[PDB]
Amino acid sequence: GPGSKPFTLPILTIGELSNSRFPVPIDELYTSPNEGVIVQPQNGRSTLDGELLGTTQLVPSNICALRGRINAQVPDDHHQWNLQVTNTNGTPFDPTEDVPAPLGTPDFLANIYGVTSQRNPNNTCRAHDGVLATWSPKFTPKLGSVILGTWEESDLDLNQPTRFTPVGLFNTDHFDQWALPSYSGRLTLNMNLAPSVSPLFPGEQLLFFRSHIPLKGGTSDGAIDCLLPQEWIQHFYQESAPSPTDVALIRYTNPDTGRVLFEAKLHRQGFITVANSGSRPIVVPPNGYFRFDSWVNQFYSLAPM
Numbered sequence: 001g002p003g004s005k006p007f008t009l010p011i012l013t014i015g016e017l018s019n020s021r022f023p024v025p026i027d028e029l030y031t032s033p034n035e036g037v038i039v040q041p042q043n044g045r046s047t048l049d050g051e052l053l054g055t056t057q058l059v060p061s062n063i064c065a066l067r068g069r070i071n072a073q074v075p076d077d078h079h080q081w082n083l084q085v086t087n088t089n090g091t092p093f094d095p096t097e098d099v100p101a102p103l104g105t106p107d108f109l110a111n112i113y114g115v116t117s118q119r120n121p122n123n124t125c126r127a128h129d130g131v132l133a134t135w136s137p138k139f140t141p142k143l144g145s146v147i148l149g150t151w152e153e154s155d156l157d158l159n160q161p162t163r164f165t166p167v168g169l170f171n172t173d174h175f176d177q178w179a180l181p182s183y184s185g186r187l188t189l190n191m192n193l194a195p196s197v198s199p200l201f202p203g204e205q206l207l208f209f210r211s212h213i214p215l216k217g218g219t220s221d222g223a224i225d226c227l228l229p230q231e232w233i234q235h236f237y238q239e240s241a242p243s244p245t246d247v248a249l250i251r252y253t254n255p256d257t258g259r260v261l262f263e264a265k266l267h268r269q270g271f272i273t274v275a276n277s278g279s280r281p282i283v284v285p286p287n288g289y290f291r292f293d294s295w296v297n298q299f300y301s302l303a304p305m
């Protein structure tokens with residue numbers, strides 16, 4: 001018994017799952033070869049036995065959020081405000097901690113539309129919409145600071161508690177969901193990253209949980225693909241079940257009929273592969289969900305989808 005607690009997945013349909021890389025619901029399953037791209041997200045990362053990796057944390061509304069205090073407005077561009085960051089749970093940020101950036105920090109390049117809000121000790125408040133540019137030279141969260149931009153040029157206070165609530169993309173300039181920010185700015189390498197992931201057996205492709213996030217203007221499918229839904233990460237953190245091999249065989253199952261629709265490989269380091277080819281969404285019955293079947297090895301041959 002000891003050291004062999006059985007592994008399980010939560011009982012949740014696709015309409016009951018959340019994206020772990022942007023704070024919205026899952027819309028569909030998706031597969032693609034992503035030919036030539038390095039897939040290395042830092043949010044939504046966990047081992048199957050419950051160790052969170054990268055910048056991953058547990059609270060859904062802290063995904064892509066920021067907290068801190070504004071120490072100064074930029075003198076020659078009053079749309080820009082210097083935010084000195086804390087952790088999203090309110091504790092001070094320790095740059096010496098062995099993570100790439102404060103937990104929850106965005107893990108992709110974009111102009112992110114959102115709202116900057118404040119509440120003073122006397123309960124006077126203000127909030128203004130604007131943009132967090134994760135590609136900016138001044139996006140240096142691992143050093144403790146980022147720049148916020150707003151249309152408002154006067155009505156934000158210095159040295160008062162501040163939060164950034166993300167909403168979506170402002171436009172598509174610089175948007176690339178697989179391009180990591182430089183968390184310490186220009187000429188400095190990222191540290192303590194969760195590793196890139198790829199299929200390791202011929203005929204297989206990654207399977208993603210995909211959301212189409214809001215866009216304020218332009219043309220885009222707004223796709224944000226995560227490797228594990230947030231609820232699976234929360235489940236593994238609680239359960240802490242050991243992994244006896246490299247790969248768990250899982251099956252998408254109708255719970256009323258028992259019919260198994262397809263099977264997939266769930267890898268120890270926290271991602272899914274399927275036997276499939278091409279770029280396509282995957283339509284599943286609204287009532288089904290993945291169930292654990294058995295433990296196998298990296299070279300197990302899946303039935304084709």
Ligand SMILES: C[C@H](CCC(=O)NCC(=O)O)[C@H]1CC[C@H]2[C@@H]3[C@H](O)C[C@@H]4C[C@H](O)CC[C@]4(C)[C@H]3CC[C@]12C
Pocket residue numbers: 079080111130131132133136137138147148149150151
């Ligand atoms: C401060 C950042 C990043 C600028 C930057 O680092 N540029 C490169 C460089 O300086 O080297 C910029 C990028 C997009 C900008 C925003 C967008 O252009 C939209 C909008 C435009 C308005 O005229 C001013 C407010 C507002 C909301 C801009 C504020 C400043 C932002 C948020």
